[PDB]
Structures are given as C-alpha cells and as structure tokens.
Amino acid sequence: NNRVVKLAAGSNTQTVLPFTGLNTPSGVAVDSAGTVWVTDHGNNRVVKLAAGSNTQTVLPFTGLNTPSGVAVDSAGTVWVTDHGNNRVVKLAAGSNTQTVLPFTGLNTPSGVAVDSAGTVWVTDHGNNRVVKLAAGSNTQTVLPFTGLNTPSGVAVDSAGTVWVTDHGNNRVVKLAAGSNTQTVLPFTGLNTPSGVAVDSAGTVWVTDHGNNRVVKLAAGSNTQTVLPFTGLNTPSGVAVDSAGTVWVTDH
Ligand SMILES: [Br-]
Ligand SMILES: [Br-]
Ligand SMILES: [Br-]
Ligand SMILES: [Br-]
Ligand SMILES: [Br-]
Ligand SMILES: [Br-]
Ligand SMILES: [Br-]
Asked: Cα separation of 47 and 37, whole Å?
C-alpha cells in the first residue's frame, strides 16, 4: 500500500505517516528521538521524517538498487543494505559521502543491524547466512545459525542476541553471541516473514508478510498476538522504540 503506519502501545488506532511518493517501501528504522528512516525500495532511495515534520527528506545516497534493510545508531549514522548491488553502504550525519563497508561475498543481502560497539550484522539472504563485521578489525565471520533458507530480517538487542526471520522456513530464530544454540521462537502459522524488531524489554515483533499481519510475542509470554493495524498488505519491515510504539512499512 506504499505507506508507513504506526501504532502507539495499547492503541487500536493507527496513524499513517506523511511520507510521499513511496514505491514498495521495505526497511524501516527509528531512534529514541522519534525520527523514522525508510528504504523506499522501488525508488532506489532512503527517506527520513523528523518527528513533528510533515515533509520527508531524502538521504544523499547514490547508486542504490532495490535497497532493503536500514539501520541507525545513536550518533545518527545510517546503514542501508543495497540489495541489488550486493553491498552495505553508510552515511554519517551531515555527510555527502557514502561509505561501502568491507563485507565480501554478499548475495542479495536483506537486513542490517548495528550495536553501540559499531559491530554490523547483515542477513546474506542469497547465501542462507548471517554475517558479522567486527568493528575496527573488519574481520568477517559467519554466525553459526543452521538450516536457514533465504533469511531476511535481522535485529540485535542490547544483550547482543541476534534475531532473524528465516523467511524461507516460515520461522523466527535467535542466537546469543558465541553460542551454538539457536532458539525457534513460538510464533505460529507464519508465511514468508520479512522483518523483526526487538525492544529493551525483550518483546519481539515480526512482519508476517504473507499473511498481511504483524505478530508479537510480549516479553514473558508464549502467546502470539496480532497488532490491530487496519488494511495492511504484505508488510515488509518493522521498528519499535522504547515504549512499544511500532512502525510498519505497508509495502
Ligand atoms: Br512540513
Ligand atoms: Br543535512
Ligand atoms: Br567513514
Ligand atoms: Br558480538
Ligand atoms: Br524448526
Ligand atoms: Br497486540
Ligand atoms: Br518484503
């Protein structure tokens, strides 16, 4: 539906954000200030809406092709998976020069996530794996997930646990750092899930793209719920801030 919708925690009444001219928006990311970044996938661009503004800005990336995931940090740096060019690119706040990260061997990468250390994780969707780029050293490693099939979304929480939507297997998996135990989350009945978001409380939200719905596992619960969005079609991406406001790209 070429729009971005949000729901405040406990609300039944979504808001449509005043983005304009979106074409198949995919990734979304938010910071604590309420700023929203969206990969406008069909237009090969990344757009941004500052809180209280009604007019988006376009980040000065160049040469993107079918960009997918987007991530941001507290310094205001923005990373975008340039899915069509098998690369990840970033822009620092206030800068006109984009930087191609030293990942190697990516194929149709999907999601991107970062932590406060500057570590970057990418779902290397076409290679059925998640790759981590260590800050400073730029060492690449492959996380020991197993059995992934076209993974798409990725998120990392403050404890450093990696969540992935295992899109081709209709499931969501998580893996703590250093670990060789992956946990399948008790979501049920998913179809080509596409985005995942996690808050500090440990709640997890997933865009269940094939079922036109956003599902949630509240922290300490084993019962999934469906957020009361209205009119969603193939939601792609999801982001949450501290408080449980949820933004979704209604791709
Ligand atoms: Br305005
Ligand atoms: Br600027
Ligand atoms: Br740089
Ligand atoms: Br790590
Ligand atoms: Br399984
Ligand atoms: Br809910
Ligand atoms: Br999607």
From this structure: 6
